[PDB]
């Protein structure tokens, strides 16, 4: 009923792949070894699923996956994580993504957690993009307590590639959010956008290190970071820009701290109080509205 990879606890429940989309999977050394292969020319309009459920205490869900997209192929992967018990959970994903000439990969991961913060979500994604390839990535963790989020991504792009990486987070209690993304525009005319949106409350700790290297002529990039601070939350925003070509151009923009005064005052001129207005802004920021 759809090319999906189901993982309940640290075991593979199902491994089904359709025509033109090879889905392999096995369990070795306590880790799950998956391999997704999108065949040359296959452009799938329906999204592939990857469900991860954890209800047992002290589970180490380690998954090593390799996603290969051949020339002119297309696929969208929708990862769903449901960790409601959250006592000793550890979801670790180590991925190697290889996007072929004029191929298109889109990844969307959504998390639904309970109110226990003993969860460690640790994705490491290495992405290699060939001439004309496209990579779209989205990580959303706005439901329940995050626990400790540790994202690491490194993308190497060739001629005419397009990269769009986004992160939406809602950190509460003693949540820790760590984001480290590097995009290297190593081919002519390769374009990138790294976007970060989020709200940090109570005693949360946010670190956002987002980087773009404009190493080739006509490579363009933009880093956009916005993070609301409420309570005793602490935020660190480190957006690095490296330029090694006189025909490359990268820009960045960030706003960190309290909500924009004009936004707040515009909503208060509608009759909303400061707390209702802030709540509207924060909900819109985290993708609730």
């Amino acid at each position: 009923k759809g090319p999906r990879i189901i993982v309940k606890e640290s075991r593979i429940i199902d491994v089904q792949g359709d025509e033109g989309i090879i889905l392999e999977g096995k369990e070795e050394d306590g880790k799950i070894k998956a391999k997704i292969i999108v065949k040359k020319g296959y452009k799938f309009k329906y999204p592939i699923h990857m469900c991860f459920g954890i209800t047992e205490e002290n589970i180490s869900q380690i998954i090593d996956v390799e996603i290969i997209l051949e020339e002119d192929s297309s696929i969208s992967l929708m990862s769903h994580c449901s960790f409601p018990k959250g006592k000793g959970i550890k979801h670790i994903m180590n991925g190697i993504i290889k996007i072929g000439k004029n191929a298109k990969f889109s990844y969307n991961e959504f998390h639904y957690h309970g109110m226990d913060g003993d969860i460690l979500v640790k994705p490491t994604v290495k992405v290699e993009i060939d001439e004309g390839g496209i990579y779209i990535s989205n990580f959303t963790l706005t439901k329940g307590r995050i626990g400790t989020l540790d994202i690491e991504q490194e993308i190497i792009a060739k001629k005419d590639a397009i990269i769009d990486i986004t992160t939406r987070t809602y950190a509460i209690k003693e949540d820790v959010v760590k984001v480290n993304e590097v995009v290297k525009l190593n081919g002519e005319n390769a374009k990138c956008i790294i976007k970060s949106r989020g709200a940090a409350m109570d005693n949360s700790k946010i670190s956002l290190k987002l980087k773009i290297e404009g190493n080739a002529p006509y490579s363009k990039g933009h880093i956009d970071c916005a993070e609301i601070v409420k309570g005793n939350a602490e935020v660190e925003s480190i957006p690095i820009v490296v330029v090694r070509d006189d025909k490359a151009r990268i820009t960045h923009e960030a706003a960190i701290g309290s909500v924009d005064k004009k936004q707040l005052e515009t909503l208060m001129a509608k009759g909303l109080d400061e707390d209702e207005a802030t709540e509207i802004i924060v909900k819109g920021m985290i993708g609730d509205l």
Partner: protein, 242 residues
């Protein structure tokens, strides 16, 4: 003094507002009456925006001398929320962009209790407000009021918000700027609709052609109200004496 105050919505008495070391408003005497489109004209640096922000209670626009009376109450200790709950609202010249707030939900914020009161009526008012500002309701209802919109789309959505709100006093800072206005008949269609509902508009503008469509016009020059009365009368004076 106390003459004709019973038919006055807003009364600004000898208002002095300082922005840093400079005194921007140097004794503003202005009144807004019930059912009136009262326009304010003046050059750049005259204090038009400062005056609009001081009435609304925007932070950093605190009077040093004078008083602002709205609905018989001196609103000196009232915040933006408290002034808005009395029927006063402000439409900024560049309406703020908001991350993740849809048009359909944005237009419900501050909406009049006559329409908010019932779901079917609130949904109808949102369609007539968007249709009044020449926006296709079905093309915009699920769009975000974020950077993605054009300046004209976002400012038309802001005029639609003023319609849904239907305030006793609507302060409009440069309502015809940034909307890609076809003609003054587009803005007059909105102004008359609000006027027929019982609203008073405090239209702040630098464009004399726009102020000619108002009932009364007050010329503010260097933080003071120089001439006030007939639109063509004070309007022509403003073009000549500047």
């Amino acid at each position: 003094g106390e003459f004709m105050v019973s038919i006055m919505l807003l009364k600004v008495e000898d208002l002095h507002v300082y922005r840093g070391n400079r005194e921007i408003l140097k004794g503003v005497n202005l009144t807004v009456e019930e059912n009136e489109i009262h326009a304010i004209i003046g050059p750049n640096g005259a204090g038009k925006s400062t005056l609009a922000y001081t009435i609304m209670g925007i932070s950093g626009y605190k009077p040093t001398k004078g008083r602002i009376i709205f609905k018989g109450v001196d609103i000196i200790d009232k915040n933006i929320t408290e002034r808005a709950r009395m029927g006063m609202t402000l439409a900024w010249q560049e309406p703020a962009r908001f991350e993740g707030i849809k048009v359909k939900n944005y237009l419900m914020l501050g909406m009049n209790e006559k329409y908010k009161k019932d779901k079917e009526i609130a949904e109808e008012k949102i369609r007539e407000a968007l249709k009044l500002v020449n926006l296709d309701p079905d093309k915009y209802l699920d769009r975000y009021v974020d950077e993605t919109l054009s300046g004209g789309e976002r400012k038309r959505i802001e005029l639609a918000s003023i319609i849904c709100m239907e305030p006793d006093l609507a302060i409009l800072d440069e309502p015809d700027s940034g909307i890609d206005i076809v003609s003054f008949d587009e803005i007059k269609r909105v102004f008359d609709y609000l006027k027929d509902k019982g609203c008073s508009l405090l239209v702040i503008t630098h464009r004399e052609e726009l102020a000619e469509h108002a009932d009364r016009v007050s010329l503010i020059c260097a933080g003071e109200v120089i001439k006030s009365g007939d639109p063509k009368e004070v309007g022509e004076f403003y073009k000549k004496e500047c």
